[PDB]
Amino acid sequence: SVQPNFQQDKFLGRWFSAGLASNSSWLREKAAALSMAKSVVAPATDGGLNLTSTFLRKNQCETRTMLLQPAGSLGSYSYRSPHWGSTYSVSVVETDYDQYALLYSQGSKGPGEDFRMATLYSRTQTPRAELKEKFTAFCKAQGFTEDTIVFLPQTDKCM
């Protein structure tokens, strides 16, 4: 479930949100109309992570921050969303720290319990073929179909 021997300090820093797969068509569609700028992973006071995402929305730069509280094994987190009335499990399932990370999220409480999402984070804004295939292979193994896998538009604005 989690990356074996996960070391949080090496997962810190700048990542690019390069791909996502979800069983929510709404989320996929909304995300694709955004243009992703950098994400930043920083240490949180609670021992977990602050995940800060920057993106273009209708030509405006927007930033959103999510607190990833430590959940179970190292590399697993919980995200509580008052708006969605739900809590989500967020796990770093595989990473080499210096090129890519694969994240998997699903609801653990509330109406969001059926929500599922896989995320490709890349240290480079354009991940090479090997990294894209690691992501698609993971998505397929997890039951995401081809048309639910989205490579996300990027932008060099907002930074």
UniProtKB/Swiss-Prot annotation:
Entry comment describing in which tissues the protein is expressed: Abundant in the brain and CNS, where it is expressed in tissues of the blood-brain barrier and secreted into the cerebro-spinal fluid. Abundantly expressed in the heart. In the male reproductive system, it is expressed in the testis, epididymis and prostate, and is secreted into the seminal fluid. Expressed in the eye and secreted into the aqueous humor. Lower levels detected in various tissue fluids such as serum, normal urine, ascitic fluid and tear fluid. Also found in a number of other organs including ovary, fimbriae of the fallopian tubes, kidney, leukocytes.
Organism superkingdom: Eukaryota
UniProt catalytic activity: prostaglandin H2 = prostaglandin D2
An annotated Gene Ontology molecular function: prostaglandin-D synthase activity
Induction: By IL1B/interleukin-1 beta and thyroid hormone. Probably induced by dexamethasone, dihydrotestosterone (DHT), progesterone, retinoic acid and retinal. Repressed by the Notch-Hes signaling pathway.
One GO biological process term: mast cell degranulation
Active site residues according to the UniProt entry: A37
Alphabetical UniProt keywords: Cytoplasm, Disulfide bond, Endoplasmic reticulum, Fatty acid biosynthesis, Fatty acid metabolism, Glycoprotein, Golgi apparatus, Isomerase, Lipid biosynthesis, Lipid metabolism, Mast cell degranulation, Membrane, Nucleus, Prostaglandin biosynthesis, Prostaglandin metabolism, Secreted, Signal, Transport
Disulfide-bond pairs as recorded: C61-C158
The EC number(s) this enzyme carries: 5.3.99.2
Enzyme class, first EC level, given as a word: isomerase
Consequence of changing Y121A: Increases enzyme activity about two-fold
GO cellular component terms, A-Z: endoplasmic reticulum membrane; extracellular exosome; extracellular region; extracellular space; Golgi apparatus; nuclear membrane; perinuclear region of cytoplasm; rough endoplasmic reticulum
Residues glycosylated per entry: S1, N23, N50
Entry's localization field: Rough endoplasmic reticulum; Nucleus membrane; Golgi apparatus; Cytoplasm, Perinuclear region
PTM statement from Swiss-Prot or TrEMBL: N- and O-glycosylated. Both N-glycosylation recognition sites are almost quantitatively occupied by N-glycans of the biantennary complex type, with a considerable proportion of structures bearing a bisecting GlcNAc. N-glycan at Asn-50: dHex1Hex5HexNAc4. Agalacto structure as well as sialylated and nonsialylated oligosaccharides bearing alpha2-3- and/or alpha2-6-linked NeuNAc are present.
Recorded coiled-coil stretches: none
Similarity annotation: Belongs to the calycin superfamily. Lipocalin family.
Entry function: Catalyzes the conversion of PGH2 to PGD2, a prostaglandin involved in smooth muscle contraction/relaxation and a potent inhibitor of platelet aggregation. Involved in a variety of CNS functions, such as sedation, NREM sleep and PGE2-induced allodynia, and may have an anti-apoptotic role in oligodendrocytes. Binds small non-substrate lipophilic molecules, including biliverdin, bilirubin, retinal, retinoic acid and thyroid hormone, and may act as a scavenger for harmful hydrophobic molecules and as a secretory retinoid and thyroid hormone transporter.
Comment, domains: Forms a beta-barrel structure that accommodates hydrophobic ligands in its interior.
Subunit organization: Monomer.
Further comment: It has been proposed that the urinary and serum levels may provide a sensitive indicator of renal damage in diabetes mellitus and hypertension. Elevated levels in the coronary circulation may also be associated with angina. Changes in charge and molecular weight microheterogeneity, due to modification of the N-linked oligosaccharides, may be associated with neurodegenerative disease and multiple sclerosis. Detected in meningioma but not in other brain tumors and may be considered a specific cell marker for meningioma. Expression levels in amniotic fluid are altered in abnormal pregnancies.
UniProt protein name: Prostaglandin-H2 D-isomerase
